[PDB]
Amino acid sequence: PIVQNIQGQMVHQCISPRTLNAWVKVVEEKAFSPEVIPMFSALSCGATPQDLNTMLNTVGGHQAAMQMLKETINEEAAEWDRVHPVHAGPIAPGQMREPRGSDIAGTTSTLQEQIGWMTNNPPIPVGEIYKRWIILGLNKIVRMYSPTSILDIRQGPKEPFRDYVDRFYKTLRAEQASQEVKNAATETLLVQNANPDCKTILKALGPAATLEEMMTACQ
Amino acid sequence: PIVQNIQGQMVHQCISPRTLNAWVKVVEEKAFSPEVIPMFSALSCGATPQDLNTMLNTVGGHQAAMQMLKETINEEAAEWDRVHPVHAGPIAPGQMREPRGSDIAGTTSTLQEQIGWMTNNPPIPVGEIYKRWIILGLNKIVRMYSPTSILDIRQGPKEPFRDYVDRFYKTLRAEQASQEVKNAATETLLVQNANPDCKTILKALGPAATLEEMMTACQ
Amino acid sequence: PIVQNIQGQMVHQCISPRTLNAWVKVVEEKAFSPEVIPMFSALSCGATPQDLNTMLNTVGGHQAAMQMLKETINEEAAEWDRVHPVHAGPIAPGQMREPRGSDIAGTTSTLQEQIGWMTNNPPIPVGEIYKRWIILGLNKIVRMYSPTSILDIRQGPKEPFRDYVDRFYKTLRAEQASQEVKNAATETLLVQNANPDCKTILKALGPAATLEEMMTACQ
Amino acid sequence: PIVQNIQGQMVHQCISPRTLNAWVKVVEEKAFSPEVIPMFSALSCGATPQDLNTMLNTVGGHQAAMQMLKETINEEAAEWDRVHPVHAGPIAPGQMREPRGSDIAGTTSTLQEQIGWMTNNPPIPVGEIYKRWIILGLNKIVRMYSPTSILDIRQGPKEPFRDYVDRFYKTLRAEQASQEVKNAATETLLVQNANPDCKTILKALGPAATLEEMMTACQ
Amino acid sequence: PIVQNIQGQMVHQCISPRTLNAWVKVVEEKAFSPEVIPMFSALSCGATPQDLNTMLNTVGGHQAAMQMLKETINEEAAEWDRVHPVHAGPIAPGQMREPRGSDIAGTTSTLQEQIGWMTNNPPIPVGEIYKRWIILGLNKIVRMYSPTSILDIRQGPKEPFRDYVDRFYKTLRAEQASQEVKNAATETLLVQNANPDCKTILKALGPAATLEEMMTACQ
Amino acid sequence: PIVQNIQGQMVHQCISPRTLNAWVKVVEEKAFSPEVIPMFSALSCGATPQDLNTMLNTVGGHQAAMQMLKETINEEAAEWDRVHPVHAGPIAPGQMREPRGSDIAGTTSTLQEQIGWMTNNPPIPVGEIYKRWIILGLNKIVRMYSPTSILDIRQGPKEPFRDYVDRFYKTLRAEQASQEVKNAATETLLVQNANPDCKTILKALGPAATLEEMMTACQ
Amino acid sequence: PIVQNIQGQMVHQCISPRTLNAWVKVVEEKAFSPEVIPMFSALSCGATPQDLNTMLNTVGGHQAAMQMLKETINEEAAEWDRVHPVHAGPIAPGQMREPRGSDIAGTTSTLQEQIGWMTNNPPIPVGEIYKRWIILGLNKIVRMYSPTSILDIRQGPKEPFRDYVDRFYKTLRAEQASQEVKNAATETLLVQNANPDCKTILKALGPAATLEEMMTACQ
Amino acid sequence: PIVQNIQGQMVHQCISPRTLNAWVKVVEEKAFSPEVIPMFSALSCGATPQDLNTMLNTVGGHQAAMQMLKETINEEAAEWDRVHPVHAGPIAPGQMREPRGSDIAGTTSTLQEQIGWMTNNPPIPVGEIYKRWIILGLNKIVRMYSPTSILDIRQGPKEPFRDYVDRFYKTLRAEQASQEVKNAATETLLVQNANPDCKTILKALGPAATLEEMMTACQ
Amino acid sequence: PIVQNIQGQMVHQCISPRTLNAWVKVVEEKAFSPEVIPMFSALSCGATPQDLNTMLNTVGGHQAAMQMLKETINEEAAEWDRVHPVHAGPIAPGQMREPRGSDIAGTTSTLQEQIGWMTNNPPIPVGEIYKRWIILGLNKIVRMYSPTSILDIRQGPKEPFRDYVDRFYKTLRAEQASQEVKNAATETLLVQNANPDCKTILKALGPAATLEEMMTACQ
């Protein structure tokens, strides 16, 4: 990845064995839990598309999942070649060149072109545009690894209310719902899917109470 | 490997014990899975041919595999001595010298010659030419470690469709097929080798559907 | 070991606890496998003879093996005192001094003399001359730890041909044969010591075929 | 310990948690094997007497052994106060002061005095004088942890000759004999304490043969 | 001007008062002698077009000469806008922009654009393209300040031959003739325009003799 | 002035005695010639308004001229307080503050505020806004020091044409006319104010000829 | 010229106005005295051939002398193209190229080629080879500026002997005689060309006395 | 000269035009006054023998004086070849070499050898040994430029006593007498060569009074 | 002098030609005016005693004055050898040594000892102790160069009162009186030695008025 030294010149360093071993052991332990994506965004900090393709290629299993990631990048590369068309023929374009969809993806671009693109006065964040293509592709992977939906999450009879909300928001995080979708679930679905006793306890609280004073009610 | 310091002078550092222990423990755990090559390309970042020969020589087992790697490099060294012939006798060639096939391979070249070759204004990437000789040799190693072919990958009766595509593209990655070869398999071989029920479900989708909306069909 | 900083001045650093723990744990796991030597040459990168003697002295077991290493260095130190004789009496030799066989070995030389010898404009690689004395001594150690010779390596009846070549070149690497010795074994000993069936399959290939197309024949 | 930076100014760094954990785990695994001393000399590289006293004080067990180390340092501190007497009264000695036996040992000296003493143009190696007091004290510790003497090391009837020389020089290293003492043992004690068969094989070799051609004789 | 620091980053420094006072005092002493141009090329080393326009604007007199320099730059700026046309409309050209003829001349370009243009991986030498426009304009200025032509340079009767060749090549340097034009003058015009006596002395030398053995002839 | 170091941090240096002596000796030699302004813009490169007020205050004579410069800055400071009004009361504005007209002029601002204003991520060029106030004030000073107008510049009878164009554009530079004003003078006033003989020579050239081929005509 | 920074990287700096003004004012004061060459060798320290050609081109007068310098360089450039012939056609010579006689002279070589040539591991001192061509050419210039020969240097009747030896060795330095030529003059020409009185005083000293005890004799 | 940078590595810089112009203008103003030597020792601070020979070669006049300096160095070079003889033949002396008398003098040594000699751990101060040869040679030059001896320095009748002691010690400094020689002159020659009146005033002071209370006596 | 670099290590630089030429030209213009001492203290900032002796030795004239400076230093060196006696014999004093009176004066101390003495943790300011010996010696020199005493300073009849106080305090500064001595002169000698008219004007002011309201009274 590109790093900032003491001076501020964006020099290029190679990916460490610590970062390589960290990303591989996340996927081996947890397959495609929703917290893997937050981890990916942190291990690949300022990474070149050569370094971003290295982290995807070192994953051993989940080859059905990595084909969805490969088809999503090919959809975004074709979208980038449509929204950003070529101006004219490169008769006098210099050594630099406007990146296509296959140059941001690291397929038709060398390492020296990717280091230059990110260091331009007006930096072309090809390491950041390609990261949003993987993350949008990783959100589709973790959506099919969700074992259940939010409509099937109901509280057990001997299950405490802290374990039910733990299962409720773990399923809601797996379906990758938005803030507006999650706001409707915490006011119209969390109370109604509880046990009858706790549910009543929660209908007496009022129309909308925060979860800090809710869970304590059913302690 | 050569590293870039704060100034930008390509100084030479030695290979760390972290990088030495990382490459050895990859080969011990997974023998010659196709993800070992992506790992190799990452641990040997800007490595001199002395450092590239060190990583090949620290592998304990798989001496049948390392002899294929040794014969592939000797084929590429003889090819480099044919496509890049000697101009004339080195009467006044200076301290520098045009590298042969045995100097890129690190056999007849010292460490001081390899550091110089890579630091020349027009750098002679002898650490990168030799890396493509190992990677081309490593692709032949992982092709013979594939336990089965793509024609023998069929879906089981109780096997879910996510596990069948996991086995299908793990075998396809082991045979190291190209993008054109893999494009024919995902449109004429993935559907036809499934279970009858799922296969029908997939023939009703149309001529060519993406895998994101395919696997979900047979959920 | 001497390291190169950002400026290029060969400053002296101490051996890290990572490098100390790496070299000790190699010898504990594998005793004197032929890949230990390649590892030694990598952990002791630019090491002073004080640092090279530290790595030999931290090995707990194999005291029969370390006495062979001690007698080999004493043979090379006496050889260095014969091929490099003293010119005259050091009446005005300055603070520097031409190293003897016992100064390269780190016995009669201080640390400040060894740092100076390696930093001279014409560097006296006393850390590299002494490393070739250990490596020549380590090759004699791993030759007596070979459990069998190459004439006793024969293919089993149910043994696959990939496992036979794995055992053949592991024994050949343990005896430390040269390239000319190994070239005669791969054309006159590898085929003849196989199983009858495979051997025939290999006599029909021709006089000399490469191992990439050979092993596949007996797949 | 004092380290050398890029410029060459001997700045003071603190002992790392890696170096602290390395020295403690050596003593926990192997109690006082003779290879612990070589390890100590490597982990405490350029260490101040504050840092040298820290490594001795973090050892949990072997309090009988650490009292021998404490009494040996007190013997060397009293010896240093005799061989290096005070010149006169320090009426105008400046901020610096000639170190006593209790200032090299780190008992009556602060950290700022020990950093100064080592950085003087004529450096007073108080971190190196105190290290020879511990190492001389550690040699007395490992001499009493030797389980047997060299006169009780005899070859077993079914014991191979490689295992007998392994036991012979491990006991000889535990008694910390000199080179002249070890030269008499390898010519008058190694052969005579072997099995009768091997011993004869070794008397036919001649008066004095090297161990490389000896052990092979009794292979 | 842009300068190279210790690291190699092309930082921008301001023009020194030493460089400002040097260029002004050249023009005050010698008006437009042909050696002023060589001086200009040396004082403006790596100068931005803001810094190149500063050196032209600090010249007090010779406003007839500076209008020829202004009209020559306007001719080269219109030529640059013809040989380097605009590719298309700058809908998505980024912060950078292809320089026109009025941006290299420093008229329609800010200082931050000129520093960027010269620091691009493929540097656009706008400080060097504009310098060739001034130097081509300065050659037209010094051609009209020549007080005489080469056909009017004849040797005086009491004038020594060293002073005649001094006047001959000072006039030839003022007319800014090429190497092919000067080669015809030194073989067909230098001898024939001398005094009769010296001329004869030079016709006896042969067809073409070098000036080192010629001037000595007429000493 | 603020300077850029090797790292790129805009540190503050003091004005050198070389720069102080350079600016004073320009005004002493030439009073308010139009080339003084170009010099001022070069000596005050990246200067703080404290440093810009220092250069104006070290001028000994021309106190009638410096009062015009003081009244012009007070006009621009009142204009800046009108075009850039205060948003609201600074209840929570932090340590930084939006500069008024008297803070850019260096009257009500300290040195620490001016260094901060220029170093902000979005730098407030208070050293550059104040420089345009002096330069606009200096253009009014040099307009009243012009000894004659352009209508009184006529060619003398024995005056050569190179000296007439020297006097014509020195007067035109003193009146500070624009490019459109100077374009009308070089096509309708330069020819008509010459000597009759030269004028005719110039009417035969055509409607509009460049000065390079014009002055030569009247050589 | 190339300078060595703190790190040791041979960065390129421009020639200072101090060095430009120093070399010009030497030639203006003393025309071609023999001490100008020693000065030239000192002002042009590590100078590129672009910088060496700049110092020759800023000399105003002595155009007869600068044509001898131009013809001497053309003789050495043709000699360099004969003693260093081209090996073969540059089909694959890289970005670097073996310098011809016109590339060392700075005629057909750019600045970027000259900086590279001097920075090569085996540096091609093109700034030092070209300096010996100027210095050999400058020795021919100062030989023709000698006003008299050594045979015409005789002591005057009222001239003291210190002034005669001052005139004797100033003429001998102007003719650029070698050490063997000057050794014959100080033993067979210095005594015989003196005044009769002093000469006798010097014949009584003996065959060969040093000048320290000679001049004192004739005090 | 060799300079010490921020790190402490003795890099080589070239002699500045300021130092070159300073040493030349000392000799032009004052010919060989005794204060020129102190100046020389200060301008040539850490100078290489190439740089020391440059300062001697840029002196225009005094060629009788520079021949005494040349003969003194040749006497010291022959003395150095006698007191420091060659040990043996340089069969294996490395790149470094023990300097002769002609290598310290800068005649048979290159610049790269002189930089190395001074940077050796045990630095061979060839720039300091050669400086003592010039200074010993410069003391012989200034001894013959003394216009009078100390026996001819007598006080005039109207001359004040401050001007007589000014002339007395200027002549004593020109003859380069030692401290023991000058101690005898200030007690037996200063008083006796004064005017009768002052002399008496000084005989009444006593046997030996300091000059601070002496000159005041004759105020 | 010792300078502080960016890091803070007190490296040793040589005295510049600017500092050498500054100190010499002060003494040539003004002989021993009282402002020369303040200048000396500023040019010799952190100077070693080698550098302090260089500045005293480059003074051409005033050899009567420099002998007073030499005798004052010899008085202070003998005083330093009495107030700071030797403790005992230097049997084990190390490389460092307590400085005597002749080592601070730079007579019996090398440059390497003086750099060390000033860099000690407890720095021995030998460059500052020796500076107070010169300054105490320079105060005795400027006391004898005073042309008149304070009792002979009387106001002339047509002399204005500003010129009388200018002459009064220039003589008082030449006699180097203390603050208590100068306080008695400004209250009992300044008024009484004026002209009668002004004196009366000053007796009407009162007992003691400041000089700001005094000189104005006699305007």
Author numbering:
A (entry chain L), B (entry chain K), C (entry chain J), D (entry chain I), E (entry chain F), F (entry chain D), ...: 1 to 219
How does the study describe this entry?
We developed an affinity-grid method employing monodispersed single particle streptavidin on a lipid monolayer to enhance particle absorption on the grid surface and alleviate sample exposure to the air-water interface. Here we generated streptavidin affinity grids with monodispersed single particle streptavidin (mspSA) on lipid monolayers, which allowed for high-resolution structure determination of challenging samples. Affinity grids could alleviate both issues by enriching the particles on to the grid and keeping them away from the AWI. Taken together, we developed mspSA affinity method which enabled the structure determination of archaea MCM and in complex with dsDNA, HIV-1 CA Di-hexamer and ScPol II EC, while providing essential insights into DNA replication initiation.
The HIV-1 CA protein is a critical structural component of the virion and facilitates essential life cycle processes through interactions with host cell factors. Previous studies of the cross-linked CA Di-hexamer (CA A14C/E45C/W184A/M185A) have reported a significant issue with angular distribution. The biotinylated CA Di-hexamers were subsequently attached to the mspSA affinity grid or prepared on a holey carbon grid as a control. During data processing, numerous particles exhibited evenly distributed 2D projection views when prepared using the mspSA affinity grid. However, the majority of the particles on the holy carbon grid exhibited a top view of the CA Di-hexamer. In both samples, particles displayed stacked CA Di-hexamers. A 3.14 Å structure of the stacked CA Di-hexamer was successfully reconstructed for the sample on the mspSA affinity grid. However, due to the pronounced angular distribution problem, we were unable to reconstruct the structure of CA on the holy carbon grid.
